[PDB]
Symmetry: C3
Subunit: 125 residues, 3 copies
């Protein structure tokens, strides 16, 4: 077991609600573990993963959820001001092969520049 | 000498070390929820990141001194030695992992 | 190939982070505010800075700019955070630029 990472961004001003955000700006996706057609990352190497995301907040409160498998694992709520902020979150999640993770915003506007990043830190041995 | 990571969150307010009791990851049990301190068991470079929701100022402590004075966010790299402890003083997460051992 | 990292803290110019939390390899030049790639590979960069500027955006730059969204005009910025993974080639430079604040970068997978 070895490498798995992806870093992606949202170029589109609106997204979408209650569905996986399909980030289209690919900063990195070498092993293509991030599915650009679904906005979901798929775990092919079991291990500890680090995910980091930032959802643009502008004029409207933002509620984001990091989903793993079929459920929301992490929640971020950010009130606006008023100011462009980022509803950010980072977490370590051990993943098994098959586990998919993606983000959702509970049309969501002014989400452009939002980013979703994740990487295999320690592979299971 | 290879794995040491944790990611925990808050299950309440009041944010003395912050005791995060929500465990996202703590496989090597290096993070102690009773004290809220992470204990370095492998010397090396660690990456710490926290997003905490608390006139209030949040600090990341290494050993017994504040490294960072910061919603309150921060990410940093701290080279730690065995015995070194790191702690902090909508989910509010505190995360840390061994990047490079030694 | 294996270690390259820095953690530093504190318009239209690289942000010179002077508070050095880590810079063992010295790949981060505090006089220019830029990180220089010596070991090609996948790097993680994260940041959280206090800006207090209007009609301004914040982004990591690499050979000049990482995420640039073409959008309609609107206004204001107080603090900004981000994180990205970038595969860097030798010679590549990365820095934070507004077109305890922190800026961390680390080589994760070396080519």
């Amino acid at each position: 077991m070895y490498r798995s990472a992806f870093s992606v961004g949202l170029e589109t001003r609106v997204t979408v609600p209650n569905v996986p955000i399909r980030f289209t700006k690919i900063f990195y996706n070498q092993q293509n573990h991030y599915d650009g057609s679904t906005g979901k990352f798929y775990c092919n190497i079991p291990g500890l993963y680090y995910f980091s995301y930032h959802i643009t907040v502008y004029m409207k409160d933002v509620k984001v959820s990091l989903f793993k498998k079929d459920k929301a694992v992490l929640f971020t709520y950010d009130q606006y001001q008023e100011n462009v902020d980022q509803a950010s979150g980072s977490v370590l999640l051990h993943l098994e092969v098959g586990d998919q993770v993606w983000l959702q915003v509970y049309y969501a506007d002014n989400v452009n520049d939002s980013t979703f990043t994740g990487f295999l830190l320690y592979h299971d041995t």
